[PDB]
Design an enzyme around this catalytic site. Structure first.
Site, PDB file in Angstrom:
ATOM      1  N   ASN A 289       0.859  -1.205   0.000  1.00 19.04           N
ATOM      2  CA  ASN A 289       0.000   0.000   0.000  1.00 19.04           C
ATOM      3  C   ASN A 289       0.882   1.237   0.000  1.00 19.04           C
ATOM      4  O   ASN A 289       1.839   1.330   0.798  1.00 19.04           O
ATOM      5  CB  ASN A 289      -0.929   0.090   1.214  1.00 19.04           C
ATOM      6  CG  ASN A 289      -1.584  -1.231   1.589  1.00 19.04           C
ATOM      7  OD1 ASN A 289      -2.460  -1.747   0.864  1.00 19.04           O
ATOM      8  ND2 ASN A 289      -1.201  -1.765   2.760  1.00 19.04           N
ATOM      9  N   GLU A 322       8.342  -5.152  -1.388  1.00 18.78           N
ATOM     10  CA  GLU A 322       7.235  -4.234  -1.251  1.00 18.78           C
ATOM     11  C   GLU A 322       7.690  -2.853  -1.640  1.00 18.78           C
ATOM     12  O   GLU A 322       6.914  -2.096  -2.236  1.00 18.78           O
ATOM     13  CB  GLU A 322       6.680  -4.222   0.162  1.00 18.78           C
ATOM     14  CG  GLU A 322       6.145  -5.560   0.675  1.00 18.78           C
ATOM     15  CD  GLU A 322       5.316  -6.357  -0.312  1.00 18.78           C
ATOM     16  OE1 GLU A 322       5.426  -7.593  -0.312  1.00 18.78           O
ATOM     17  OE2 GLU A 322       4.552  -5.777  -1.090  1.00 18.78           O
TER      18      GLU A 322
HETATM   19  C1  LIG Z   1       7.844 -11.276  -1.388  1.00 16.72           C
HETATM   20  C2  LIG Z   1       6.379 -11.460  -1.746  1.00 16.72           C
HETATM   21  C3  LIG Z   1       6.142 -12.794  -2.453  1.00 16.72           C
HETATM   22  C4  LIG Z   1       5.536 -11.311  -0.484  1.00 16.72           C
HETATM   23  C5  LIG Z   1       4.060 -11.514  -0.837  1.00 16.72           C
HETATM   24  N1  LIG Z   1       3.415 -10.185  -0.930  1.00 16.72           N
HETATM   25  C6  LIG Z   1       3.042  -9.674  -2.124  1.00 16.72           C
HETATM   26  O1  LIG Z   1       3.190 -10.235  -3.198  1.00 16.72           O
HETATM   27  C7  LIG Z   1       2.381  -8.328  -2.184  1.00 16.72           C
HETATM   28  O2  LIG Z   1       3.277  -7.417  -2.870  1.00 16.72           O
HETATM   29  C8  LIG Z   1       0.979  -8.519  -2.835  1.00 16.72           C
HETATM   30  N2  LIG Z   1       0.672  -7.491  -3.811  1.00 16.72           N
HETATM   31  C9  LIG Z   1      -0.160  -8.532  -1.802  1.00 16.72           C
HETATM   32  C10 LIG Z   1      -0.981  -9.810  -1.731  1.00 16.72           C
HETATM   33  C11 LIG Z   1      -0.410 -11.029  -1.324  1.00 16.72           C
HETATM   34  C12 LIG Z   1      -1.173 -12.204  -1.250  1.00 16.72           C
HETATM   35  C13 LIG Z   1      -2.526 -12.171  -1.585  1.00 16.72           C
HETATM   36  C14 LIG Z   1      -3.104 -10.959  -1.984  1.00 16.72           C
HETATM   37  C15 LIG Z   1      -2.344  -9.783  -2.054  1.00 16.72           C
HETATM   38  C16 LIG Z   1       3.445 -12.516   0.120  1.00 16.72           C
HETATM   39  O3  LIG Z   1       4.096 -12.898   1.131  1.00 16.72           O
HETATM   40  O4  LIG Z   1       2.302 -12.956  -0.156  1.00 16.72           O
HETATM   41 ZN   LIG Z   2       4.316  -7.914  -4.750  1.00 18.37          ZN
END
Ligand SMILES: CC(C)C[C@H](NC(=O)[C@@H](O)[C@H](N)Cc1ccccc1)C(=O)O
Ligand SMILES: [Zn+2]
Ligand SMILES: *[C@@H]1O[C@H](CO)[C@@H](O[C@@H]2O[C@H](CO)[C@@H](O[C@@H]3O[C@H](CO)[C@@H](O)[C@H](O)[C@H]3NC(C)=O)[C@H](O)[C@H]2NC(C)=O)[C@H](O)[C@H]1NC(C)=O
Ligand SMILES: *[C@@H]1O[C@H](CO)[C@@H](O[C@@H]2O[C@H](CO)[C@@H](O[C@@H]3O[C@H](CO)[C@@H](O)[C@H](O)[C@H]3NC(C)=O)[C@H](O)[C@H]2NC(C)=O)[C@H](O)[C@H]1NC(C)=O
Ligand SMILES: *[C@@H]1O[C@H](CO)[C@@H](O[C@@H]2O[C@H](CO)[C@@H](O[C@@H]3O[C@H](CO)[C@@H](O)[C@H](O)[C@H]3NC(C)=O)[C@H](O)[C@H]2NC(C)=O)[C@H](O)[C@H]1NC(C)=O
Ligand SMILES: *[C@@H]1O[C@H](CO)[C@@H](O[C@@H]2O[C@H](CO)[C@@H](O)[C@H](O)[C@H]2NC(C)=O)[C@H](O)[C@H]1NC(C)=O
Ligand SMILES: *[C@@H]1O[C@H](CO)[C@@H](O[C@@H]2O[C@H](CO)[C@@H](O)[C@H](O)[C@H]2NC(C)=O)[C@H](O)[C@H]1NC(C)=O
Ligand SMILES: *[C@@H]1O[C@H](CO)[C@@H](O[C@@H]2O[C@H](CO)[C@@H](O)[C@H](O)[C@H]2NC(C)=O)[C@H](O)[C@H]1NC(C)=O
Ligand SMILES: *[C@@H]1O[C@H](CO)[C@@H](O[C@@H]2O[C@H](CO)[C@@H](O)[C@H](O)[C@H]2NC(C)=O)[C@H](O)[C@H]1NC(C)=O
Ligand SMILES: *[C@@H]1O[C@H](CO)[C@@H](O[C@@H]2O[C@H](CO)[C@@H](O)[C@H](O)[C@H]2NC(C)=O)[C@H](O)[C@H]1NC(C)=O
Ligand SMILES: *[C@@H]1O[C@H](CO)[C@@H](O[C@@H]2O[C@H](CO)[C@@H](O)[C@H](O)[C@H]2NC(C)=O)[C@H](O)[C@H]1NC(C)=O
Ligand SMILES: *[C@@H]1O[C@H](CO)[C@@H](O)[C@H](O)[C@H]1NC(C)=O
Ligand SMILES: *[C@@H]1O[C@H](CO)[C@@H](O)[C@H](O)[C@H]1NC(C)=O
Length: 902
Positions: A289, A322
Site C-alpha cells: 500500500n 514491497e
Molecule cells: C515477497 C512477496 C512474495 C511477499 C508476498 N506479498 C506480495 O506479493 C504483495 O506485494 C501482494 N501485492 C499482496 C498480496 C499477497 C497475497 C494475496 C493478496 C495480495 C506474500 O508474502 O504474499
Molecule cells: Zn508484490
C-alpha cells in the site's frame, strides 16, 4: 443486449477525479458481539459519454444516506438529473444509481453516501485484528484492499486503471494513533458529538489506484529515521515489540533500499514518508500500500537473539519486494489483472537487487535460481501450466482475479524479467525502465508498453544486437506456457530445443501460436572461459562450433542460469564436466555447479538421461564448500529419501551421504572454531546449516554427538540457550531423536513458554523427531487440543510427525480414525484438509498402500472431504506415479548407492 450492471467490468462512461472518505471504526462490539465501522464518502467524477446510470463498486455495505442510497450533485454550475432509484446488485458487487435523465460529456458530478459495514476479522476491506498484550485482548482497525476489497470499505470505481486522488479522514478513540497512505494534515482534533473520539485528516494522496489505499487505527508505536532528502521512515509495531528493539533491522535496511530503487529507477520516491507496519497474523504476508506497507510480524520484525540468518534474509527481501512496488506497480500500474505477472514478476526480481544493496556481502542475487527459477520450473514443466499472459477478456470475476496470484506470475515472471535484463545488459534495461516509468507516471500500462520502451533503448544504441524485436522474443516467453530443454551434442555442436515436461508420456493439449518454439539466449563457458553469446532462433535444430568440443574439452551452457531453460548434453561432455568437478571445481561458476545437479535430475525424471548420470553429478560434493550445489542435491534427493527411507535402498543412501558430507562437516568444525563462531557471509552460513542438517539426519556420529552435547548443555541451563538460532532445528530434532521423555518434556515445556513464533515452530517440528512410538502417539493426542496446540498449527504438527518414518504409520492411522472431524472443523476455521492429506500420503509408493488409500476413500458416505475434496484424487494419482517410479528405479538406484558408499 445485456444490462451494464450485470457485466463484471465497469462502464468507461464515468471516470473518477477525486474522493473524500471518512471512516470511523467501532472497536468495542455491540453486545451481540458485532463490531462495525461507519463511513461517509464523496466521489467526484467526470462524464465521458452520455449515460443515465451510475455504476460503482460496493460490497457488504449498508447505506444510511438520507433519501436514496446516494445524494447526487453537479459541480460548479452543472445541473444534475433526479435519481429514479438506487439498488445494490450483489453478484457483480455494484451500487447502481438509475437517473431520470442523462449526465453530460465534460460535466463533473459529486456523489455522496453514508454507510456502514461489519468490521469483521476477515482480513478483507476495513477489518479488525485482535491480539494479546499482557492480560488484555487488543483490537485494532486496518485495511487490505488487494485486490477487489476497496469496495468493501466505501463505494468506489474499484478498477486499478481508474485512479483518483484520495482525501482520507479517520475518526477514532482519542488515545489511539491513526495512519494512512499520506501524512496527517496537523494535529487530531476532538469529535464534537463525542470528544472521547478524535479526527485525523490526512494530506491528499497522489493520483492512485483504490487497491493501494490503506488506513489503520491502533495503539502501535514506531522507530523513526529521517533519510537525508527529508523522507520520514517509520517502522510500526506492537508497543512491546518496539520496546524489544525488533524493529531495528527493518529501519536499518529501509532507507538504503529506498535510495537504491530511487537510483536504479532513475525516479524520486513519490511520497513524503514511508510507513511500514507489522501486524499480528496478517495471513496476506505483505501488501505494498502506497506509503503504508503492511507486513505480518514474522516478516518485518527481527530478534537478533533468537532469529536465524534465513529470517534476516526473509526480512530484507520482503521489504525490498514491497518497496520495489512503490515505483513499479504503484507509480505506474498495470491496467488490468491479466498483466499482474508483470507487476509481481518485476518485484520478485528486483527484491534481490534491493536487498543486495542493503546486504552487499551476502550475494543475494544468486538465490533467485533455487528460490524462483527451479521452483517454478517444477510447475511450468507440466501440461497443466499456463502462459504469463492471459487474455484480459478472460479475467473478470474477483475469483478469476485472485487466480492471477500464483507461482507462474511471481516466479516465472521474475525468471523471465531476469533473463530479459541479462540479454539487454542491466544498464540498457534500466534505461528503458526509466523511460517507461517517466512516460507513464500516475497512469496505467500493459506489458506491450514495457517492451516498447525497452525497444526504444535498444534502438538508441549499437553495442547490443538482437535476433528480433524485444516484443517478438518476449512473446515466446509470455504468450505460451512452459520452457525448452536445450540439448547439445558436443561431438558435432548440434543444438536442439523441445518443450520440456517432467512426464515424458504426458499429452500437451494446450496449443501455442509458436508450436512450442522459443527464441533463446544462450551464454556458454568452454574450459572455464566465457564464450561468445549465441541466440537460438525459433527452430528445432541448429549447429554452431561454439558447442563443438574436443576429447579433452568440455562445454557448459546457460551461465549462472540467467536463461529460462534447462540443458542436456551427450554423455561424454557430461563425463568431462564431472571430471572438472572432481579435480578443480572452482573453474565452473558455483551456480552452474548447482545447475548440473538440478537439470540432470529433471532430465532423468523426463527419461532424457539415466538416473545414474544424475547421481554421478553428486559425486563431486565431497569437496564442495558452497551452499548452492549442496542445496540442489538435497532438493533433488528429498524425493528419493521419501520413496526409499523404508527400504533396503536407505542404508546405502545414508552410507553414501555420510561419505559426501563428512569432509564438509569437518571443514566447518575447523572454520567455526569447534562451532563457537558462525561463518562470515550468508551463503557460507547456509552451507553450514545444510551440512549439519544432512550430517545429523544421515547419522554421522560426530554430528549426533554435537547435537546431544549441546542439548545436554541446554537442559542443564534452561535460561541460557547455547544453540545458535541457525542450527536450532537440526540440533533440537536430532537430540530429541537420540533421547527419551527427558528431552521431549523439556522441549515441550520450552514450547509452551516460548514467546516468539519462529522458536515455537522449531520446537514443534523438533518434537516430531522422537523415535518413540508412545511419545509420537501421545503428541498426536495433543494436536486436537487447543489448550496445548493452536488449531492453526494442528495439521502442520500432524505432517511433521508423518515426516518421521516411525511416525508415518502413526499419523496415517490418526487421520483415518479422526476423519470424523471434518464436521467439527469446517465451520470454525478452515483447517486445510488438503495439506494434511498430501503430507500424510506423501510416502505412498506401493500397490498395498494404494488399496489402503482406496479403502479409506470408501467412507465417501457424506462427511465428504471438505476443502481437501479431490485433494484425495491427487493423492491417489500421486501414489500410482510413485509405484511406477519405484519399480523402474529401485534396482538401478540401490546398486549405484552400494557401488558408491565406499
Ligand atoms: C515477497 C512477496 C512474495 C511477499 C508476498 N506479498 C506480495 O506479493 C504483495 O506485494 C501482494 N501485492 C499482496 C498480496 C499477497 C497475497 C494475496 C493478496 C495480495 C506474500 O508474502 O504474499
Ligand atoms: Zn508484490
Ligand atoms: C472534501 O474535503 C475537504 C476538506 O474537508 C473540503 O474542503 C473544505 O471545505 C470546508 C467547508 O466545507 C472549508 O472549511 C471552512 O468552512 C467554513 C464554513 O463555515 C468557510 O467559511 C471557510 O471557507 C472554510 N475555512 C477556511 C479556513 O477557509 C475548507 O476551506 C475546505 N478545506 C480545504 C479546501 O482544504 C471539501 O469541500 C470536500 N469536498 C466535497 C466535494 O465536499
Ligand atoms: C446491514 O444490514 C443487514 C440487513 O439489515 C443486517 O443483517 C441483519 O442482522 C439482523 C441482526 O443483526 C438479523 O436479524 C435477527 O436479529 C435478531 C435481533 O438482533 C436476532 O435475534 C436474530 O437471531 C436475527 N435473525 C436470524 C435469522 O438469525 C438479520 O437476519 C440480518 N440480515 C442479514 C444478515 O441478511 C446487518 O446487521 C447490517 N450490518 C451492519 C454492519 O450495519
Ligand atoms: C543496525 O545497524 C547498527 C549499525 O551498523 C548495528 O549495530 C551494530 O551491531 C553489532 C552486532 O550487534 C555490534 O557489534 C558488536 O557487538 C558486541 C555485543 O555487544 C560488542 O561486544 C562488540 O563491541 C561489537 N563489535 C565488534 C564485534 O566488532 C556493533 O557494535 C553495532 N554497531 C553500532 C554502530 O552500533 C545493529 O546491529 C543493526 N541492528 C540489527 C538488528 O541488525
Ligand atoms: C481533496 O483535497 C484536495 C486538496 O485540497 C482538493 O483539491 C482541490 O480541489 C479543488 C476543487 O476542485 C480545487 O479548487 C483546488 O485547486 C484543489 N486544491 C489543491 C491543493 O490541489 C480536492 O478537490 C479534494 N477532493 C475532493 C473530492 O473534494
Ligand atoms: C485507551 O483508552 C481505553 C479506554 O480507557 C483503554 O482501554 C482499557 O484498558 C484497560 C487496561 O488499562 C483494560 O483493563 C480495559 O478493559 C480497557 N477498556 C476497554 C473498554 O477497552 C486503553 O488501555 C487505552 N490505551 C492506551 C494506549 O492508553
Ligand atoms: C536520472 O538519470 C540521469 C542520467 O543519468 C541523471 O542526470 C545525470 O546526472 C549526472 C550527475 O553527476 C550528470 O553528470 C549527468 O550529465 C546527468 N545526465 C543528464 C542527461 O542530465 C538524473 O539526475 C537522474 N534523475 C533522478 C531523479 O534520479
Ligand atoms: C490509463 O492509461 C493511459 C496511458 O497508458 C491513459 O491515457 C493517457 O491519458 C493522459 C492524461 O489524461 C494523456 O496525456 C494521454 O494522451 C493518454 N494516453 C493514451 C490514451 O494513450 C488513460 O487515461 C488511463 N486510463 C484511465 C481510466 O485513467
Ligand atoms: C547435426 O545436424 C546435421 C544437419 O543439420 C545432421 O546431418 C545431416 O543428417 C541428414 C539425415 O539423414 C543427412 O541426410 C545429411 O546428409 C546430413 N547433413 C550434413 C552432414 O551436412 C547431423 O546428423 C546432426 N548430428 C547429430 C544429430 O548428432
Ligand atoms: C556469475 O555469477 C557470479 C556469482 O556467483 C558472478 O560473480 C560476481 O560478480 C560480481 C561482478 O563481477 C562481483 O562483484 C561479485 O563479488 C562476484 N562474486 C563472485 C563469487 O565471483 C559472476 O561474475 C557471474 N559470471 C558471469 C559470466 O555472469
Ligand atoms: C495420451 O495420449 C497417448 C497417445 O497419443 C496415450 O498413449 C496415453 O494413454 C494418453 N495419456 C497419458 C496420460 O499418457
Ligand atoms: C584450480 O583453479 C583455480 C580457479 O581458477 C585456480 O586459481 C587454481 O590455480 C587451480 N588450482 C589447482 C590446484 O589446480
Amino acid at each position: 443486449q445485456s444490462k451494464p450492471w450485470n457485466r463484471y467490468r465497469l462502464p468507461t462512461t464515468l471516470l473518477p477525479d477525486s474522493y473524500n472518505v471518512t471512516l470511523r471504526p467501532y472497536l468495542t462490539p455491540n453486545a451481540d458481539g458485532l463490531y462495525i465501522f461507519k463511513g461517509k464518502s464523496i466521489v467526484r467524477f467526470l462524464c465521458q459519454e452520455p449515460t443515465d446510470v451510475i455504476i460503482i463498486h460496493s460490497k457488504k455495505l449498508n447505506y444510511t444516506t438520507q433519501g436514496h442510497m446516494v445524494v447526487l450533485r453537479g459541480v460548479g454550475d452543472s445541473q444534475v438529473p433526479e435519481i429514479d432509484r438506487t439498488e445494490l446488485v450483489e453478484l457483480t458487487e455494484y451500487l447502481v444509481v438509475h437517473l431520470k435523465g442523462s449526465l453530460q460529456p465534460g460535466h463533473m458530478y459529486e456523489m455522496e453516501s453514508e454507510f456502514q459495514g461489519e468490521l469483521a476479522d476477515d482480513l478483507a476491506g476495513f477489518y479488525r485484528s485482535e491480539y494479546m498484550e499482557g492480560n488484555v485482548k487488543k483490537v485494532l482497525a486496518t485495511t487490505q484492499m488487494q485486490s477487489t476489497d476497496a469496495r468493501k470499505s466505501f463505494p468506489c470505481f474499484d478498477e486499478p486503471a481508474m485512479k483518483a486522488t484520495f482525501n482520507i479522514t479517520l475518526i477514532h478513540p482519542n488515545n489511539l494513533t491513526a495512519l494512512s497512505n499520506m501524512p496527517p494534515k496537523g494535529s487530531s482534533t476532538p469529535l464534537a458529538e463525542d470528544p472521547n473520539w478524535s479526527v485525523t485528516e490526512f494530506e491528499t494522496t497522489p493520483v492512485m489506484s483504490t487497491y493501494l489505499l490503506a488506513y489503520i487505527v491502533s495503539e502501535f508505536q514506531s522507530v523513526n529515521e529521517t533519510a537525508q532528502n527529508g523522507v520520514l521512515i517509520r517502522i510500526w509495531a506492537r508497543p512491546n515489540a518496539i520496546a524489544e528493539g525488533h524493529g531495528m533491522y527493518a529501519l536499518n535496511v529501509t532507507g538504503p533500499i529506498l535510495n537504491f530503487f530511487a537510483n536504479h529507477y532513475n525516479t524520486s520516491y513519490p511520497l513524503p514518508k514511508s510507513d511500514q507496519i507489522a501486524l499480528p497474523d496478517f495471513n496476506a504476508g505483505a501488501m505494498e500500500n502506497w506509503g503504508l506497507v503492511t507486513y505480518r510480524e514474522n516478516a518485518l520484525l527481527f530478534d537478533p537473539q533468537s532469529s536465524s540468518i534465513s529470517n534476516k534474509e526473509r526480512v530484507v527481501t520482503v521489504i525490498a519486494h514491497e518497496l520495489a512496488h512503490q515505483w513499479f506497480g504503484n507509480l505506474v500500474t498495470l491496467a488490468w489483472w491479466n498483466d499482474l505477472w508483470l507487476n509481481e514478476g518485476f518485484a520478485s526480481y528486483v527484491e534481490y537487487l534491493g536487498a543486495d544493496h542493503a546486504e552487499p556481502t551476502w550475494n543475494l542475487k544468486d538465490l533467485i535460481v533455487p528460490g524462483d527459477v527451479y521452483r517454478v520450473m517444477a510447475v511450468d514443466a507440466l501440461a497443466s501450466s499456463h502462459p504469463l499472459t492471459t487474455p484480459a477478456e478472460e479475467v473478470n470475476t474477483p475469483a478469476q482475479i485472485s487466480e492471477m496470484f500464483d507461482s507462474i506470475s511471481y516466479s516465472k515472471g521474475a525468471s523471465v524479467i531476469r533473463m530479459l535484463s541479462n540479454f539487454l545488459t542491466e544498464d540498457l534495461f534500466k534505461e528503458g525502465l526509466a523511460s517507461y516509468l517517466h512516460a507513464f507516471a500516475y497512469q496505467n500500462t500493459t506489458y506491450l508498453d514495457l517492451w516498447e520502451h525497452l525497444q526504444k533503448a535498444v534502438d538508441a544504441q549499437t553495442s547490443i544486437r538482437l535476433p528480433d524485436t524485444v516484443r517478438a522474443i518476449m512473446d515466446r516467453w509470455t504468450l505460451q506456457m512452459g520452457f525448452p530443454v536445450i540439448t547439445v551434442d558436443t561431438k558435432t555442436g548440434n543444438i536442439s530445443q523441445k518443450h520440456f515436461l517432467l512426464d515424458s508420456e504426458s499429452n500437451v493439449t494446450r496449443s501455442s501460436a509458436f508450436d512450442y518454439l522459443w527464441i533463446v539466449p544462450i551464454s556458454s563457458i568452454k574450459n572455464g572461459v566465457m564464450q561468445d553469446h549465441y541466440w537460438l532462433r525459433d527452430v528445432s535444430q541448429a549447429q554452431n562450433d561454439l558447442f563443438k568440443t574436443a576429447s579433452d574439452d568440455w562445454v557448459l551452457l546457460n551461465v549462472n542460469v540467467t536463461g529460462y531453460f534447462q540443458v542436456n548434453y551427450d554423455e561424454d561432455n557430461w563425463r568431462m564436466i564431472q571430471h572438472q568437478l572432481q579435480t578443480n571445481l572452482s573453474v565452473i561458476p558455483v551456480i552452474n555447479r548447482a545447475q548440473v545437479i538440478y537439470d540432470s535430475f529433471n532430465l532423468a525424471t523426463a527419461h532424457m538421461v539415466p538416473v545414474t548420470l544424475a547421481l554421478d553429478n553428486t559425486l563431486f560434493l565431497n569437496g564442495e564448500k558452497e551452499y548452492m550445489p549442496w542445496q540442489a542435491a538435497l532438493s533433488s534427493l528429498s524425493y528419493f529419501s521419501l520413496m526409499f527411507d523404508r527400504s533396503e535402498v536407505y542404508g546405502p543412501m545414508k552410507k553414501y551421504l555420510r561419505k559426501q558430507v563428512e569432509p564438509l562437516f569437518q571443514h566447518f568444525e575447523t572454520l567455526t572454531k569447534n562451532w563457537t563462531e558462525r561463518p562470515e557471509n550468508l551463503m557460507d552460513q547456509y552451507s553450514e546449516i545444510n551440512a549439519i542438517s544432512t550430517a545429523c539426519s544421515n547419522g554421522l556420529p560426530q554430528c549426533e554427538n554435537l547435537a546431544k552435547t549441546l542439548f545436554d548443555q541446554w537442559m542443564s541451563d534452561p535460561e541460557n540457550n547455547p544453540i545458535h538460532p541457525n542450527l536450532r532445528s537440526t540440533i533440537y530434532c536430532n537430540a530429541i531423536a537420540q533421547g527419551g521423555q527427558d528431552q521431549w518434556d523439556f522441549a515441550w515445556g520450552q514450547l509452551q513458554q516460548a514467546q516468539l513464533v519462529n522458536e515455537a515452530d522449531k520446537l514443534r517440528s523438533a518434537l516430531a523427531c522422537s523415535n518413540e512410538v508412545w511419545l509420537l502417539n501421545r503428541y498426536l493426542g495433543y494436536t486436537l487440543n487447543p489448550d496445548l496446540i493452536r488449531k492453526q498449527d494442528a495439521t502442520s504438527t500432524i505432517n511433521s510427525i508423518a515426516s518421521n518414518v516411525i511416525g508415518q504409520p502413526l499419523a496415517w492411522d490418526f487421520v483415518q480414525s479422526n476423519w470424523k472431524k471434518l464436521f467439527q472443523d469446517y465451520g470454525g476455521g478452515s483447517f486445510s484438509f488438503s495439506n494434511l492429506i498430501q503430507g500424510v500420503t506423501r510416502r505412498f509408493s506401493s500397490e498395498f498402500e494404494l488399496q489402503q488409500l482406496e479403502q479409506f476413500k470408501k467412507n465417501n458416505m457424506d462427511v465428504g472431504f471438505g476443502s481437501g475434496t479431490r485433494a484425495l484424487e491427487q493423492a491417489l494419482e500421486k501414489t500410482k506415479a510413485n509405484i511406477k517410479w519405484v519399480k523402474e528405479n529401485k534396482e538401478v538406484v540401490l546398486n549405484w548407492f552400494i557401488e558408491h558408499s565406499s
